[PDB]
Design a protein around this ligand. Structure first.
Ligand SMILES: CCCCCCOc1ccc(C(=O)N[C@H](C(=O)NO)C(C)C)cc1
Lengths: 248, 251
């Protein structure tokens, strides 16, 4: 019945707002969408950056991503049925879902020329990121995904349901009880479909186009982790950085 | 109008039957009990194999089947409304990237958890036998079995698959495409047709449409794993020849 579907959509939206500080609505108003109170500092080269380069940028991204995981974790616990799953299955779903979610939400903060950083008080150009060492290949395939993903023109109410769909996948390795997970994901998928039909009545087969983006998304995540291995292949030793690499 | 969508579904199923010699219907009519004029000979070891012809030989037999499959898929693609009216370069790109995803979708029709039909359904080669092949070749088919067992649980029939295969071809997020708009226009039509087909054919199956579209994620990874395997085989088997058509498809 369409009432608990809209109820679910509204519920996810509100939770998404509470959990994630920088919404797409706010990000877009800051990006090339302009407004008149505060423009972000723009990092376009080595001197404008000047707060250490290459390694320290990568490390800055890890700090932020560790923050993101905790925001996503809180959001997951608001998905009806999630906290009632097997504890091991909750951990597994977050462990394998969090990267997909991070690059999905990161698109909200990107345009074809750069990405918002530091709660949007900053902007790092796409071109500055390409000019880096082994690290100049990290962000670029994310930019290419974002350009295509953002073409769908989803807003936060759409993204909230989509993010829940990703978390409740069901094909994650090592799950103990797949049934209640795919039951929840069936319900979320229904809510997303209705949401897209109501929010974007003249965008045909948007639901289908969005799900097809998961194919790009998972290969991006796969490529990314393999890239992460190559960096554990040159800077390695002297951990006067003790528990902080333990945090990571 | 649903009527134009039904007519498109019927057109595609028709071309599917005309293009592909071994349908899911027939493959499921050799595998299960059913008919006993179409019982396959079963290959499960070397002696039962030599009721035939190993490793490298199986692999090149597989190569030739793939090449055939490219011809069948190409003939099918041309029947898809608007496909042949596209920029010739984009026709080539769509097939380049579409062909293996379709092969592994169709391959699932020929599979159960225990093995796979071969030689147009006259033979059946065991999963365990395939997994026991020397080193590199033993990991070739196993992830295709993994996919098939899960894909086959959707219980699609040939009229479902016909439209799904067309949807795969007309992607538009394919690398290198020149004009994405007319491709995406065709795919939207195909997606509407698929959506209708699945709700009329599987009325009690909730969100089958979304669940099927998600399988596209598994297909992509199978192809990606498969390319990595071939890179390995080409380095260890310097005396083994890969077909030029297959080489052109890979990069
Ligand atoms: C639509 C026609 C589908 C016919 C199904 C044939 O079954 C298969 C399954 C897997 C393969 C396969 O992976 N071939 C590899 C391949 O295509 N590498 O590119 C190698 C061995 C040639 C080929 C045929």
């Amino acid at each position: 019945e369409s009432a608990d579907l809209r109820a679910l959509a509204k519920h996810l939206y509100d939770s998404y707002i509470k959990s994630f500080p920088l919404t797409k609505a706010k990000a877009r108003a800051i990006l090339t969408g302009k407004t008149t109170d505060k423009s972000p500092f723009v990092i376009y080269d080595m001197n404008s950056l000047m707060m250490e380069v290459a390694i320290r940028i990568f490390q800055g991204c890890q700090f932020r991503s560790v923050e993101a995981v905790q925001e996503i974790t809180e959001y997951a616990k608001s998905i009806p049925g999630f906290v009632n799953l097997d504890l091991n299955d909750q951990v597994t779903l977050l462990k394998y879902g969090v990267h997909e979610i991070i690059y999905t939400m990161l698109a909200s903060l990107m345009n074809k020329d750069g990405v918002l950083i530091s709660e949007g008080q900053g902007f790092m150009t796409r071109e500055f990121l390409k000019s880096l060492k082994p690290f100049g290949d990290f962000m670029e395939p994310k930019f290419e995904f974002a350009v295509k993903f953002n073409a769908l023109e989803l807003d936060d109410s759409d993204l909230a349901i989509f993010i829940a769909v990703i978390i409740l996948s069901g094909d994650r390795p090592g799950l103990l009880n797949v049934k209640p997970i795919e039951d929840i994901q069936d319900n979320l998928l229904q809510a997303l479909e209705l949401q897209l039909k109501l929010n974007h009545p003249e965008s045909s087969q948007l639901f289908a186009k969005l799900l097809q983006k998961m194919t790009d998304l998972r290969q991006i995540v796969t490529e990314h982790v393999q890239l992460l291995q190559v960096i554990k292949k040159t800077e390695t030793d002297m951990s006067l950085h003790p528990l902080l690499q333990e945090i990571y």
